[PDB]
From a paper:
Here, we report cryogenic electron microscopy structures in which a p300/CREB-binding protein (CBP) multidomain monomer recognizes histone H4 N-terminal tail (NT) acetylation (ac) in a nucleosome and acetylates non-H4 histone NTs within the same nucleosome. p300/CBP not only recognized H4NTac via the bromodomain pocket responsible for reading, but also interacted with the DNA minor grooves via the outside of that pocket. This directed the catalytic center of p300/CBP to one of the non-H4 histone NTs. Representative writers of lysine acetylation (Kac) are E1A-binding protein p300 (EP300; KAT3B)8 and its homolog, CBP (KAT3A), which can transfer an acetyl group onto the NT lysine residue(s) for all four histones. That is, p300/CBP reads H4NTac at the bromodomain pocket, rotates in multiple directions, and rapidly writes NTac to non-H4 histones within the nucleosome independently of the DNA sequence.
Of these complexes, the p300BRPHZT·H4acNuc complex, in which HAT is in close proximity to H2BNT, had the largest number of single particles and its structure could be determined at the highest resolution (p300H2B·H4acNuc). We obtained the 3D reconstruction density maps of p300H2B·H4acNuc at 3.2–4.7 Å. Around HAT of p300BRPH, the density of H2BNT toward HAT could be modeled for the C-terminal residues after D22. The distance between the substrate-binding pocket and D22 (~10 Å) suggests that p300BRPH of this complex acetylates lysine residues from the N-terminal side of H2BNT up to K16. Besides p300H2B·H4acNuc, there were several similar complexes at low resolution in which H2BNT was located near the substrate-binding pocket of HAT. This is consistent with our biochemical results that p300BRPHZT facilitated acetylation of multiple lysine residues from K11 to K20 of H2B when H4NT is pre-acetylated. Thus, it is likely that HAT of p300BRPH can acetylate various lysine residues around K16 of H2BNT by a similar structural mechanism. In p300H2B·H4acNuc and p300H2A·H4acNuc, bromodomain binding to H4NTac interacted with the minor groove at the superhelical location (SHL) + 2. Also, acetylation of H2BNT was structurally the least dependent on the DNA-binding activity of p300 HAT among the histone NTs.
Numbering used by the authors:
A (entry chain E): 38 to 135
B (entry chain H): 22 to 124
C (entry chain G): 14 to 118
D (entry chain F): 19 to 101
E (entry chain K): 1051 to 1204, 1232 to 1523, 1578 to 1664
F (entry chain C): 14 to 117
G (entry chain D): 31 to 124
H (entry chain A): 36 to 134
The structure:
DNA sequence: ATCAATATCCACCTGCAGATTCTACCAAAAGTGTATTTGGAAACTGCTCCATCAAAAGGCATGTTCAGCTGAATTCAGCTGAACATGCCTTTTGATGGAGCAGTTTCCAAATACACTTTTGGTAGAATCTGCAGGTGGATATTGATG
DNA sequence: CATCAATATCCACCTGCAGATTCTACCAAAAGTGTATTTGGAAACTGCTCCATCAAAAGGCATGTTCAGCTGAATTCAGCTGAACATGCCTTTTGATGGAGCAGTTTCCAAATACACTTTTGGTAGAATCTGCAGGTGGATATTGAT
């Protein structure tokens, strides 16, 4: 059975998702999550589709930047695998946490 | 004859100091503030004033509103101040406006 | 007869806030209760911040508020720290904080 | 309206993996996904409320794209293409 | 010559032992070595401390004043060639202070009065073309033949010079004393100057000074004032208290003329007399300090008797008053001043005068009313402090039941149901006539005069004091005022200008105790010489 | 009959910029040359980013500028990237960037 | 319907001037409109702050020029300043 | 005879506490003023400076440095270390987005 | 004029080194740094240098805008706040 | 060193939603011309306050030694990457009641625009008060080192 | 691991001073009230766009499982680079002091609103033609892993 070495498919995905620009988060689950957050904030709310798209791309871009920072911290720690402490460090340096 | 003209160049500048000191007497009658402390307090109150006024002006512009009222200011208080601080500031503003109206 | 601050039970001058709002080019019209509400919010902020500063001063065996006391007041309150996260305090210093790994044994 | 719940699990593990791939991350530890989810939730809690605070101010009952983009701008995350 | 060497070795040795301040003067100034090729261009007498020692050793100095002049020439050269910010200037200042401390006992040990280099303040000149302006100090001025002077707006130079003190040579020993230090006057002692050492060696004493304040002609007012002051001092019993002599030294009848504005407005209508006659009197206060008369207080007053037309009738006005803070004791000094003024306020109310007027106008900086060159350490009172001083003096007068009451001029005008500018007193040189003329002019560009008068009255109410000496019906049935004191013709005090001009021309300064004593002695000699014609 | 935009030789609407400045409540008074200067600056920036986007599209064998082309143009210019360091471009993605350590 | 103004024809003309044979998509057009609006708002706000700090109640070319210098980095700022100076010179030359 | 010598870190921690409990300025006034003057003259010659402006610039720069140094210490600790190296400050500035 | 003592003080060109080693050490200690590498200092110097043209240029751009020749504290205050680093006490 | 199993690059062609090209309206801009108002150019000037220099002194720059920090080499438990089977749930196209977003009229309470009297805050100068910065004396862990 | 001993420092107490606090008086700038004029958006009604909801089919990844490659983590040990410290001096700070420019005063002219006409034209409803690339097909070409 033909099998690729670990990291080859990951790097193929690296080019694949750094070349294309379509959304990677499913529309309906994220819309449901946005509805849940709105319901927790204020009862009886409605959402425009363009507002949903704007929120989705904003969160996607923020998470992409956070993942880039986390990866930079990971290699900074002589590692290839990111761990939650890397995200904590990135958020602390960004000033979002402390 | 003419005297104490001071060459007509008496530089003056406005400041919240004397008011803030009064607030100090409301919270700590036996505590004082240094010149650096009052300068920092004036800078802080000016910065808060500028931020809240800019937020209120932007919010009024968003709804095509040419008049600034307390509604968009309290909305900006909710936006900019954190939860407990925003809630207490909103309550204080509401009580002050209610008392002013009934005054 | 009575000042607007006195009528609203306020210490900061309502008239000065109204004048600054007029001159600040924030809107072409300015409401009557807008300066009152803004003055009340500012009074609450100064009251809480000077209360925390006095608490820090009395904890530091001090009776005069210095920039160090103001820095301690703002930084030990996470809400004030979030409010002033992009603000640096003149002559305020930083909180005493030593990292765990740097500690001995 | 139905009270939606447990929708944070809708951000699937492959979705977070794809987001990391777009972010240039080659390897993912097991505890990453959930953690990122929480961060994502915080981000939403950072924006939607503000937009809601906008929506409440305009006497409107629907969230518009202008509210979202302006809340993102006031959060220092200005977005283009949505007005 | 070894005597002066033995005397002057400690003084220069104390100068040398000051380190590292005195190092730059150890050797002749070397321009090329120091990189200052302009030293000879500005300094015309290059020499140093080593040259001073060589002259002190090689039989060059005949008498110590030459050595004093040499060391002070070094001080002046160092000060002129170097800015006061520079190191050398401050080193020179410290060494000058050391020498001033050291030389005085040594110079006195040689029989000399002192060893100080004393120079007068710069002498402000006067214009000759305009006959009214003066030559400003530290400003561009024109001069010709050293006799004619002109201002910039009327040889081009700037007036920054210092006049040294004169010297008198003793007739017996030939030593030179300062004229001010020993207080020697040629008129008083035509026989010549003899130093104190020579007088004590032969058990002689200086001839009695016939040109003294006590020997000045006596007057009722001066005698009364001096008696009151002496009684007060005797009551106090102060160890430093002395004898105070008060003499009325000028008294002349003059007239004040209505200015053209008020002359046109009221005099031409037959509502005012064209002029008001009065008697102006100038008196000075003298005290004996160290056996020498010293002037410490003087004032100028104008008295309008019962013959004067109203509203100036029976009114006294204090035009100018001045004092010098050298009275002993200091603590009673101010009180002594009061003991003068109240006494005057008593004397007039004995004659029949009912109203007194005081203008509390403190002198401006650099300006003197009577005594020229006030001491630098004598503070000029501020208007509020001067007003409080006048109020205290008036309260003390009231406590003696001499003064019934005193008021501000605004309250006095309000009580006097004043309705026109005609009811205010008209005094010579007073502020009110000038401000009334200015108000009339302002009306010319535009009860209006009365309204402006009331505005100015309220604006400057705290400055003018009106004192009621006789009040009630007793003020309505007084006998005519007759002055027992005869007229004293003396042009030297016809106004405060003549005395100030004489003091400026003859360098009669009051900036120090010795200088003030010398000025007082010169004033007494001038008065005694002017008395005889 | 000469428009104020054509009077300065600009393509952007000077009158619209002036009207927006008046409606923006930035000051009680606005100078005459301020809308002209602002229109010139905005049109220069529009030309710069549009030219870079067209070059990026040509590099991608594309003659229609898409959001990806705008992102490629904005992120490939240092000054332009600094200008929009806190701006997210819609549907733009990210630059292809892989560091050596992850590479085999 | 209420008119919603935009920089449509102006940006299209700029595109034709710089790239006659290159077009833009709708989403990219919206991005460009958002960009120009954001730059306008930033420069105008900076100029307003500049006028407020100097006690000036009038916004002239100098204030917005200084705002552009503050915001635009280096070569972008220099080119924008030169182009705007040329524009105002031609505007005042007629 | 064996002079007293603190171990590496004791004096370090002591001065850590001392400088975190104090607020006095750490940069000397004259060299920083000279640096600011020359940086300003790199943009506009013959400029003049207020004392308050220099003090404000110094306080701002020291605050930025103390914040950045906190970030660098956190980054160095993240790598199982206690000593900072230029890679730590580079990472801190990259995360902050300055570079 | 003389003098007696005068040092050239050739430090103007290399004034970036004018930031003393103990100054950077103290700054790091205030930042909680326990151990400092030898390559930090000059690097931080460059970082310091950068911050200058991040702020003072704007202040200079302020000073030129006000037709003034003297850099004021108010220019510095707006220069810092425009970078998101608002300073209190110098208003 | 060669080779088989896959992903990559790429030319080509077809159907179409999106990009591009005319026709007509038009009201919201956009432009021109007086009357009006005014922020600011311009000159002279008083007054801050900024550049410059010398002494006191408070640290800053260098050399030594080594305990400890950092970094290289080795090993492994296991975890996450790669592959695959199963299928579910998201995606796409279509339609629909209706809550709600938004355009138009009316018009009053709220806003603005001076005139004016009231008081209130900003600044100068005097003089008394005081919190605190250091200075001196123990003296309190404490940590390095001795044992 | 228990404790002689040098050392930095919290505190117990002090005492002098720059700075904070108190009080009086002056005075221009706000500030509140009044009267007239103006208008922003609330309510009242209603046209209408898209937001939410329901329905049906399907396949693309979503979810789960299995095997193992290599990677973080642990361990060990060695070159060595900064920490602590003694030694020398030297750069800094502050006080004092000329004058370069920051503001205060006064004139007035080029320049920016207010507003009533008059003309251009950027959105934009509508229909028709053009067109770049989404998507599927097929085969040439690196890529990779271990045969």
């Amino acid at each position: 059975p033909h099998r690729y070495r670990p990291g080859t498919v990951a790097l193929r995905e690296i080019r694949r998702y750094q070349k294309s620009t379509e959304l990677l988060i499913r529309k309906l689950p994220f819309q449901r999550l946005v509805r849940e957050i709105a319901q927790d904030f204020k009862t009886d709310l409605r959402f425009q589709s363009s507002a949903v798209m704007a929120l989705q791309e904003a969160c996607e871009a923020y998470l992409v930047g956070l993942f880039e920072d986390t990866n930079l911290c990971a290699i900074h720690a002589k590692r290839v695998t990111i761990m939650p402490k890397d995200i904590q460090l990135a958020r602390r340096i960004r000033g979002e946490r402390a | 004859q003419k005297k104490d003209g001071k060459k007509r160049k008496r530089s003056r500048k406005e400041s919240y100091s004397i008011y803030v000191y009064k607030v100090l007497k409301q919270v700590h009658p036996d505590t004082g503030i240094s010149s650096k402390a009052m300068g920092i307090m004036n800078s802080f109150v000016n910065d808060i004033f500028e931020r809240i006024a800019g937020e209120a002006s932007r919010l009024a512009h968003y709804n095509k509103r040419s008049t600034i009222t307390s509604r968009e200011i309290q909305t900006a208080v909710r936006l900019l101040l954190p939860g407990e601080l925003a809630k207490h500031a909103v309550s204080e503003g509401t009580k002050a406006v209610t008392k002013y109206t009934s005054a | 007869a009575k000042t607007r601050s006195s009528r609203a039970g306020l210490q900061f001058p309502v008239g000065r806030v109204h004048r600054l709002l007029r001159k600040g080019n924030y809107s072409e019209r300015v409401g009557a209760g807008a300066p009152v509400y803004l003055a009340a919010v500012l009074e609450y902020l100064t009251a809480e911040i000077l209360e925390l500063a006095g608490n820090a001063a009395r904890d530091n065996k001090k009776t005069r508020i210095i920039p160090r006391h103001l820095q301690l007041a703002i930084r030990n309150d996470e809400e004030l720290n979030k409010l002033l996260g992009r603000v640096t305090i003149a002559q305020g210093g930083v909180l005493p904080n030593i990292q765990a790994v740097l500690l001995p044994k | 309206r139905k009270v939606l719940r447990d929708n944070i699990q809708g951000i699937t593990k492959p979705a977070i993996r794809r987001l990391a791939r777009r972010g240039g991350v080659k390897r993912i530890s097991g505890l990453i996904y959930e953690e990122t989810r929480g961060v994502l939730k915080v981000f939403l809690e950072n924006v939607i409320r503000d937009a809601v605070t906008y929506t409440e101010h305009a006497k409107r009952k629907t969230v518009t794209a202008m509210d979202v983009v302006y809340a993102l701008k006031r959060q220092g995350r200005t977005l283009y293409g949505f007005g | 010559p070894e005597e002066l060497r033995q005397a002057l070795m400690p003084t220069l040795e104390a100068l040398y032992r000051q380190d590292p301040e005195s190092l730059p003067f150890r050797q002749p100034v070397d321009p090329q070595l120091l990189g200052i090729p302009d030293y000879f261009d500005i300094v015309k007498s290059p020499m140093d401390l080593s040259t001073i020692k060589r002259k002190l050793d090689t039989g060059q100095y005949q008498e110590p004043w030459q050595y004093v002049d040499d060391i002070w020439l070094m001080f002046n050269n160092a000060w002129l060639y170097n800015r006061k910010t520079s190191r050398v200037y401050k080193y020179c200042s410290k060494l000058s202070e050391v020498f001033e401390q050291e030389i005085d006992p040594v110079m006195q040990s040689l029989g000399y009065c002192c060893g100080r280099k004393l120079e007068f303040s710069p002498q402000t000149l006067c214009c000759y073309g305009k006959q009214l302006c003066t030559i400003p100090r530290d400003a561009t001025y024109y001069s010709y033949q050293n006799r004619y002077h002109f201002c910039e707006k009327c040889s081009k130079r700037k007036n920054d010079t210092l006049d040294p003190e004169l010297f008198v040579e003793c007739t017996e020993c030939g030593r030179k004393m300062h004229q001010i230090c020993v207080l020697h006057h040629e008129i008083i002692w035509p026989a010549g100057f003899v130093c104190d050492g020579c007088l004590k060696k032969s058990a002689r004493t200086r001839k009695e000074n016939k040109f003294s304040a006590k020997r000045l002609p006596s007057t009722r007012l001066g005698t009364f004032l001096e008696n009151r002051v002496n009684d007060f001092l005797r009551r106090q019993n102060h160890p430093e208290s002395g004898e105070v002599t008060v003499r009325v030294v000028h008294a002349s009848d003059k007239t004040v003329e209505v200015k053209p504005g008020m002359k046109a407005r009221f005099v031409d209508s037959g509502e005012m007399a064209e002029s008001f006659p009065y008697r102006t009197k100038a008196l000075f206060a003298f005290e004996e300090i160290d056996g020498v008369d010293l002037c410490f207080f003087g004032m100028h007053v104008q008295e309008y008797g019962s013959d004067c037309p109203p509203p100036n009738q029976r009114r006294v006005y204090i035009s100018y008053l001045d004092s010098v803070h050298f009275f002993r004791p200091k603590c009673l000094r101010t009180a002594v001043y009061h003991e003068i003024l109240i006494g005057y306020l008593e004397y007039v109310k004995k004659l029949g005068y009912t109203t007194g007027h005081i203008w509390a106008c403190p002198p401006s900086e650099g300006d003197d009313y009577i005594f020229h060159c006030h001491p630098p350490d004598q503070k000029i009172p501020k208007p509020k402090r001067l007003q409080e001083w006048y109020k205290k003096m008036l309260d003390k007068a009231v406590s003696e039941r001499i003064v019934h009451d005193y008021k501000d001029i605004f309250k006095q005008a309000t009580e006097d149901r004043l309705t026109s500018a005609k009811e205010l007193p008209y005094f010579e040189g007073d502020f009110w006539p000038n401000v009334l003329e200015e108000s009339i002019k302002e009306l010319e560009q535009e009860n209006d005069l009365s309204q402006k008068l009331y505005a100015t009255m309220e604006k400057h109410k705290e400055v003018f004091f009106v004192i009621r000496l006789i009040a009630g019906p007793a003020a309505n049935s007084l006998p005519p005022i007759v002055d027992p004191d005869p007229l004293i013709p003396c042009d030297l005090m016809d106004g405060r200008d003549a005395f100030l001009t004489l003091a400026r021309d003859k360098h009669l300064e009051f900036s120090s105790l010795r200088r003030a004593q010398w000025s007082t002695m010169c004033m007494l000699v001038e008065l005694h010489t002017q008395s005889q014609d």
